[PDB]
From Swiss-Prot:
Quaternary structure, from the entry: Homodimer.
Domain of life according to the entry: Viruses
Function: Cysteine protease that cleaves viral polyprotein and specific host proteins. It is responsible for the autocatalytic cleavage between the P1 and P2 regions, which is the first cleavage occurring in the polyprotein. Also cleaves the host translation initiation factor EIF4G1, in order to shut down the capped cellular mRNA translation. Inhibits the host nucleus-cytoplasm protein and RNA trafficking by cleaving host members of the nuclear pores. Counteracts stress granule formation probably by antagonizing its assembly or promoting its dissassembly.
Organism listed in the record: Coxsackievirus A16 (strain G-10)
Active site per database record: H15, D33, C104
Stated name of the protein: Protease 2A
Reaction(s) catalysed (UniProt annotation): Selective cleavage of Tyr-|-Gly bond in the picornavirus polyprotein
UniProt: Zn(2+) 1 binding residues: C50, C52, C110, H112
Amino acid sequence: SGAIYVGNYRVVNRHLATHNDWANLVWEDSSRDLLVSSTTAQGCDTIARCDCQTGVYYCSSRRKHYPVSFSKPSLIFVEASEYYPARYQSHLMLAVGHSEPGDCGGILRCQHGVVGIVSTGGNGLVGFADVRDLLWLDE
Ligand SMILES: CSc1ccc(Br)cc1CC(=O)N1CC[C@H](C(N)=O)C1
Ligand SMILES: [Zn+2]
């Protein structure tokens, strides 16, 4: 689990959104596994606006933050799970690292701020849903 809190927005994995996030929906995209809902309180996360390919992510299944190299956002085939059938997920970045289903939501950060959140994984890989292209999160 986990979320990004920027301005009056809450960014979570779409598959983990609560009935309350859907009522306060701003934007969602099943193909990106992202949902953004409105908040009453102002958030303090800064979103990165960069092309960094190295960063640090939080892995809740290890209670550890790991430095990683990750690929640029791309369209990647993602195996079936209890939340989606087998499909291509867009704006996804992969890294070699540990992840379990409940790690989704953990933040990936570079020197510029938040890059994205854990969204996919398994077999020694971890995938992150990029948020750096969502320029509107800043206004
Ligand atoms: C970090 S996700 C993960 C990790 C290890 C294993 Br094995 C399997 C997973 C995959 C997983 O459960 N999902 C849920 C939905 C998500 C998606 N974005 O399609 C992928
Ligand atoms: Zn950066």
